[PDB]
Amino acid sequence: MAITTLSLPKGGGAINGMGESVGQAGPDGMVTFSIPLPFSAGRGVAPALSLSYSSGAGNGPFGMGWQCSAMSISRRTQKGVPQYNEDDEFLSPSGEVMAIALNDSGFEDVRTANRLQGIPLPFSYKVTRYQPRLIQDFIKIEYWQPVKQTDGTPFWIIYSPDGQTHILGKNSHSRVANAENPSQIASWLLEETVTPTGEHIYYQYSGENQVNCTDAEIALHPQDSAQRYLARIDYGNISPQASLFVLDEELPNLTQWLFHLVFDYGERDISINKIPTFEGGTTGWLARPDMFSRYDFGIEIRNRRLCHQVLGFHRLEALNDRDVTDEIPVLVNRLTLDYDLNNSVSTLVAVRQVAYETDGSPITQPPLEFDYQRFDTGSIPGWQEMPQLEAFNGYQPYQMIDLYGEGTPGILYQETPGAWWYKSPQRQIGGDSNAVTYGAMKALPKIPRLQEGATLMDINGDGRLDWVITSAGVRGFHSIHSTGEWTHFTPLNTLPTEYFHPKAQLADLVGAGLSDLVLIGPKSVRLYANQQGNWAPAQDVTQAENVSLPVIGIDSRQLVAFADMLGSGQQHLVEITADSVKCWPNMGHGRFGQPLTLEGFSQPQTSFNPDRVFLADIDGSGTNDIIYAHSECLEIYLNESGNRFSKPISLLLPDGVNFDNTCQLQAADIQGLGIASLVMTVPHMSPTHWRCDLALNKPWLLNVMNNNRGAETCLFYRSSAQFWLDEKQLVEAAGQQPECHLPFPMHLHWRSEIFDEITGNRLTQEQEYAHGSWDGQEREFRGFGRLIQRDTDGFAQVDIPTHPSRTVSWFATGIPEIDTTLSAEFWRGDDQAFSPFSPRFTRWENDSEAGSDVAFIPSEHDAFWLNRAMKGQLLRSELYGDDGTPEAEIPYSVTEMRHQVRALPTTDATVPSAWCSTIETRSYQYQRVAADPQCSQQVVIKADRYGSPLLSVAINYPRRKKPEKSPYPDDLPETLFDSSYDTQQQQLHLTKQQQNYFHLTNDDNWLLGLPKEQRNDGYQYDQERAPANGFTLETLIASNSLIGSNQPFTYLGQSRVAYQGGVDEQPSLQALVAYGETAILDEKTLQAFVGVLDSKTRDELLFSAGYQLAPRLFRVESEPDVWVARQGYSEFGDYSQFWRPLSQRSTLLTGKTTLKWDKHYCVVIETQDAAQLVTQARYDYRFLTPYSLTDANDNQHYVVLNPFGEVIASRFWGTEAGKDAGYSTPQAKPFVVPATIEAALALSPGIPVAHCAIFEPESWMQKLTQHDVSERMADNGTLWNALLQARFVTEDGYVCALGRRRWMARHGLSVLMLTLLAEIPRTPPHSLTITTDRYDSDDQQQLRQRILFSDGFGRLLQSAQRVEAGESWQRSEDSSLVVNVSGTPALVVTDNRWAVSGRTEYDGKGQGIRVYQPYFLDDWRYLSDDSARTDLFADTHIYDPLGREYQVITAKGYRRERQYTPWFVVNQDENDTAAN
Amino acid sequence: QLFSKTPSVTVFDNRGLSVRDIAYRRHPDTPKVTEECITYHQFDFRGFLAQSLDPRLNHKEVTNFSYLTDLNGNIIYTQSVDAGNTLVLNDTEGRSVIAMTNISRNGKDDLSLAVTRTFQYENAPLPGRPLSVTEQVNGENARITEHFVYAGNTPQEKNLNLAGQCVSYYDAAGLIQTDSVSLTGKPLSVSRKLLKNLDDTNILADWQGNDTSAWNSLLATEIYTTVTRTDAAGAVLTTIDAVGNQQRVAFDIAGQLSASWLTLKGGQEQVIIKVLTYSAAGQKLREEGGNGVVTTYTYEAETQRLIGIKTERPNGHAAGAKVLQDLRYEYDPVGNVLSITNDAPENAYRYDSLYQLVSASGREVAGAGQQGSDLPSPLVPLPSDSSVYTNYTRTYTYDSAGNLMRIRHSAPATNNNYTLNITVSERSNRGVMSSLTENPADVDALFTASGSQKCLQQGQSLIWTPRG
């Protein structure tokens, strides 16, 4: 490293986009995609927010499934309504459970304090260091409560290992709190952070308000005051402060922060043809069609707003430090956030980067565009008969549950003692792996099953069923496994509530999965009592007497239910008449909110028998929908966002059928599809059953990703129950026993295609998984036992035979009964490979020597928690590729890991906290030959209470015995197979590396594990030294370890750093280096000198080379000193100078260098070296970037940039020995770059500039407008306007990329939408440039007329340069070759000749197969892929599954060939290969 | 097509280090026999080269090479029976402190010929560049081979763009005064001073004495200079060459040469090119020399391999219309030349699988006799008739290590025949014409410690001098 020089520009590049690709597989299997926000770093202190979609998410201002949350710390409530007292529980921002820590004296972290960072506080706080149950990394938490509640509010502080330090929720805007008693706070938002540089970021929120809020919004949702949204962030503080700005009695002015992020929720004019105002205007933030509300805390949230635009602002004349009045920051760039809207949901259609020209024009990037699989009412299929069930319903003949945990119910007809006969869901034979059927019944041993309050209820909430015993005086259950293991009887610490009656028996409001009875009606509320399948006392409560009273059981054209119209998940009380609906907000224990009416339902009061209604949610949101029977038709009412109801869909029944009091309608997932179908019996005829597959796909899944550059995707998704049906099919084909315990049909990613819009090639990738896993005690997901991926491209081309990818992997579920079995799944063609790793359970000890862990035997509890901690650790993976060869059954390689779990003490008398560690790693490189892998392993030995990697060892194993005969082909010269060996292959090697650290870890400093010292050494051994199963931890620690303290070695290195700081060159809080240090020469190395030198000449050469002797690191007693280098000598400002680097000197032997910074200490304005070579620069603070430079000779360079900060023109000029040379000064001769390629081709030479460039990122899309088409169709431009709302065309008039499909297809509308395109061919995103070879004072000025083309991603596709006129091939306007009558490329003279360069065709992984030769062209525009494939010469690179060329073909069939083995690689040329 | 099954293979240790490599060899004279040639790379405890060797000395079980290093980094010391030894050292910054050469193969190698180079530097504040280095002759007349002057930042220097420049480099044979520069970075000028009399072999160009008050005794009156101007792209715009010559040039849009003119000494400047034109591959395509003779070029468009080049004289030319050549070339798939022909007729070749060119045949002139240390007479006048040249075979022989054995020829209709030996060392690459000695043990005495050869011919001693 050396000086950050003032930099001469490179002058060019290639077109960008953003974050274009989704990651690989994971044991969640969930679809997600994400990109960081495109906004400036400032001085390197700027926020890390990102857009993200996940199929796992709920709803928010980002739109459904979208997510860009700031960091916040919060209560924990998924068990149910919190207490708002001592007994409350809380969660880390990462999402982890939190508990009171212990001090190392063996007592809790209680103290009181009267200062913060030692800044004295106005009043004292009780303060507590806080401990998560599981560490990801050792961030420190302290919570802060007033010593008495009158003394303000509690708040939170966070300390990073890198010392970045953060405060949450000191103020109400940064706090989410009970609107009607703010003494209760739910969450503390990130409010400020501080760096050791005294730099900060500050976060400004807003609450809700009645801006654009209706009467109904007030009447139903008055108590909005709890809600918050992010209004602004600001950063680049002008004054440094090592303490928090919150410690100011008032926060400094907006002007004190020089960079601002402004969030706008549709307030400013959303039109692009105007620069946004910094202020918002009179709109305010908008409304939305689809406001939701949440009650997840026993209190309301109401959610009215969505973004539309976000704006980045730099305080320009402050940053320039040139003016102080009226500091209007300029908008550097505007993010557009563009949404699809519906009365129940909204989500992004698109997003764009935008910036604004000095004339006020927008300039725009090509959008990124989305689509989602979505609900519909138009397409619904006709009903279908159900032979499988066709009569077996209508009172007794139906019985059903998923006893087996299929994720799908089985029809368990049961009639008498024993009649338990499970007609079971089976795959149909043939067809797609979607077809399913109920197979025949089976009998299994079972309870006497009667007189008992019979029911297959899971009483415990396991997800797995018991059967209820409640006969006179007789009370308990059995439990039944998926195996059908009816466990022995269970008395229950039995204390169920007395069953007066079932009348109004409650279930849900105790908390999800915790259900318990309450018998209740007006003016009173009994309490539920169930915990985990036992019970509390059934206490009494009431809500306030004003609250309207819900009460079940009157038939008078009316109904009541526990069913969530609202779709929060709480199955709220709802009451229904012939004419109206009312629903009561969940309020937890003994309590309800005043009910809300839901508008829209009604039916003729003359005839509304209540039971003709059916209850299901249909839209998939959570909002319970409504169905009502006419004898000929269904009326289907869909819930608008949980607020009111759509116009009812009217559905014709099966032909000739009539619905009647015998008929039983239902909805179910007999499809296993994860979205239900209507299912019905009509017990009139012998056949009775019917279904409608209303839902074709689960809605609300982001199913297409695109950018208008040319990236587009098809995305595919599948039910876990379907995967398990495939598994069960194979399990019974093996006759194995089903214990894939996962009682829920989660639905997950399956397949995706990425299609290159340009070349028409594509990439196929698919995944599968097995042993879906569940926590039967905590009631939570535990992953899959196994994951699998496969992949190929698809090719426009037979020249590429694919040889498809496979890989398989295994991960910790944390369930021994499963986890054990996974070992049996492993490939074992080799068997000399070592026996596996295993998880090391260990306890940390402050051992009164230095601290250590100690491995130990957990109890059954501890083991449960520790395995739950190992949850998700990667255990193993196994790599393959498939072809015609009998070794696709052999891996290329295999990988395996050992983990160790550290337990930690707690105030929690029930469980410890934990941390997990990846203590060993090993791999075998097979190259698909099982016999003779290369093998290597890497291991850790020493770590502290903070787990630093103090000592490591790594191993490379000796070769196996020479093979008994060639596993390799016969083509080899046979001697090779006897020759390819060395004793070195039998030499075992081990490697030692060891290190230690500083810990400024006290008060408000939390600087964990700062680098202090490091050393390297190495070992070598004979094969016969190899331990029996290779090494493990237990091998490497041993007294007889090959790297134990007895064992001599070659020393190989050491390194150190001297800090500048308060003592002993120990780190400052800023831990600035004083110098770096490394070892260079050693006693053994000196023996090279011994042939020439002597002591004096040696020493003087060393000292003149600048080295010195120093203590050798980790020297135990007697080791010699060693020669070291010391480096990096540099100096820095104080905190007031933001510790900015003022000077640097790589070594004291060299001349120094000197730095000069702006007043904000942001920019190095100017510099000089110690030979006194000056360099100068002047800066565009839009971009923190020099628009000017001056060299030490006082030659200027100058450059100008677009609103995004793209370099677009440049020039240089200066001094020339009694003359001034280069171009003119810019202000002496101004210029502006032309708008288009043709506008540039119109230019003369003699321009006063070194360069300019032009770009089209949008070139891929056609741009279409009223001008022409109004003649052709003259529909008064109504299309011309409405195609935006149709999103066929953008606001800037480009054909929108998904739009092109969207509006042509949706109703097959006008063929014009295609007809008017190709007169502009879709043109690869491209640039043109000129640079000028001579000064504009010479009328000879050569112009480098050059163009370049890139894909929808950033891959360079091709380039060209204009050349002198002459013979050339000829392009067609449709991009075809022009050709002669014989189809020969039209080789003819042209004036407009180009040389074409760099073209190739590429794998999706970018590998160029066909690398083409150079050719002439007559045109700048692109030449077609089809014609290129037809005529143009290329060599063809041929890639293995790792992506290595095992062959290349010439353009004329001769080849270079290479073949890979673990120990050697074979190579063959075009002549030897001509044997083929 | 001999080449079937002649691959090459490389082999590794468990650290993945390139322990061994193999090449299969097969002479077309020996089509039934395939040789396997191999050599080894031993690696150290550091994971770096311990030993690698000549194949034949190795399989004769002799060890003849060495390589030794710092703690990691690079070689300190390194010997071969061929190279002699070599030692260096450099700074933490990689600046050199010392180098030595021409050290023999005995307890220790001979340092008396070490010809030591050592270095003298810029110091604070200056960045630290060498201001001089010297030939520190071991025990002998140590002498300062060179000296650097680095400029300051005077406005003069800035205008000359010489700020910080190596505005002087005194050196063997004298000095370059780096005496002006353009803002493009290309020179505005340089002056060269050769020695006070460059004739005088014993004015050493070693810069004894403190400054040119002395060194004028060692720099010429016959001092010369170049002056230059350039493109912003840096290509030459014009130049002057102080003895009386000068330069101008012009280019095509990609920067390719269109035309040029040069001032002859003290006189006119005149056009060189009449035509010059290029392929899509940028390589030349169509040209016409300043005499007016016309050329064109021909390529395999699949590969850009040059298949031929053709030249003729135009109608009524001063030397009359004539095809001057039509070069055509024959290649194997790898591209090795199998044959050539021309008209204004043919020749042909043979190779080992290892692509030793084992045989060549075609036309050669009669009567020149066996080639020695000589150039025989031209045929005069230019032969009007062809029979003065005649068929030949020429053939060659080689080791499995990197050495030749003999060369073997007939031009039978001339009766010119030979087979002639390079005697080569029993334990090195050192080797000579048989005339000097036929004995492979004795031959290795005919060389310096660096392995530079003693003689051209029976008594033609080679005056090797410091800095090799």
Curated annotation (Swiss-Prot), chain A:
Residues 383-692 are annotated as: 5-bladed beta-propeller domain. Signal peptide: none annotated. Residues 21-372 are annotated as: SpvB-like domain. In the N-terminal section; belongs to the SpvB family. Pfam families: SpvB (PF03534), TcdB_toxin_midC (PF12255), TcdB_toxin_midN (PF12256). Semipurified toxin complex consists of at least YenA1-YenA2-YenB-YenC1-YenC2-Chi1-Chi2. YenB and the N-terminus of YenC2 form a large hollow shell of beta-strands. The shell is closed at both ends, within which the C-terminus of YenC2 is probably found. The Yen-TC:K9 subcomplex is about 26 nm tall and 22 nm in diameter with 5-fold symmetry and 5 copies of YenA1, YenA2, Chi1 and Chi2; the chitinase subunits may be solvent accessible on the exterior the complex. The Yen-TC:K9 subcomplex has no insecticidal activity. InterPro entries: Integrin_alpha_N, Sal_SpvB, TcdB_toxin_mid/C, TcdB_toxin_mid/N. Keywords: Secreted, Virulence. The keyword 4Fe-4S does not apply. PROSITE patterns: RCC1_2 (PS00626). The gene is yenB. Residues 389-698 form a 5-bladed beta-propeller domain which closes one end of the shell; the other end of the shell is closed by the RHS repeat-associated core domain in YenC2. GO terms for cellular component: cytoplasm; extracellular region. Disruption phenotype: Cells with a disrupted yenA1-yenA2-chi2-yenB-yenC1-yenC2 locus are no longer pathogenic in C.zealandica larvae. It is found in: Secreted. Toxin complex is secreted when grown at 25 degrees Celsius or less; at higher temperatures the proteins are present intracellularly but not secreted. This is Toxin subunit YenB. Part of an orally active toxin complex (TC) with strong insecticidal effects on larvae of the Coleoptera Costelytra zealandica, Acrossidius tasmania and Adoryphorus couloni and some Lepidoptera larvae. The TC has an endochitinase activity.
UniProtKB/Swiss-Prot annotation, chain B:
It is found in: Secreted. RHS repeats lie at residues 163-177, 292-306, 324-338, 345-358, 391-405. Disruption phenotype: A double yenC1-yenC2 deletion is no longer pathogenic in C.zealandica larvae. It comes from the Bacteria. Residues 610-690 form a beta-strand plug which closes one end of the shell; the other end of the shell is closed by the 5-bladed beta-propeller domain in YenB. Semipurified toxin complex consists of at least YenA1-YenA2-YenB-YenC1-YenC2-Chi1-Chi2. YenB and the N-terminus of YenC2 form a large hollow shell of beta-strands. The shell is closed at both ends, within which the C-terminus of YenC2 is probably found. The C-terminal region dissociates from the YenB-YenC2 complex at pH 4.5 but not 7.5. The Yen-TC:K9 subcomplex is about 26 nm tall and 22 nm in diameter with 5-fold symmetry and 5 copies of YenA1, YenA2, Chi1 and Chi2; the chitinase subunits may be solvent accessible on the exterior the complex. Part of an orally active toxin complex (TC) with strong insecticidal effects on larvae of the Coleoptera Costelytra zealandica, Acrossidius tasmania and Adoryphorus couloni and some Lepidoptera larvae. The TC has an endochitinase activity. Belongs to the RHS family. This is Toxin subunit YenC2. The chain holds residues 4 to 485 of 970 of the full protein.
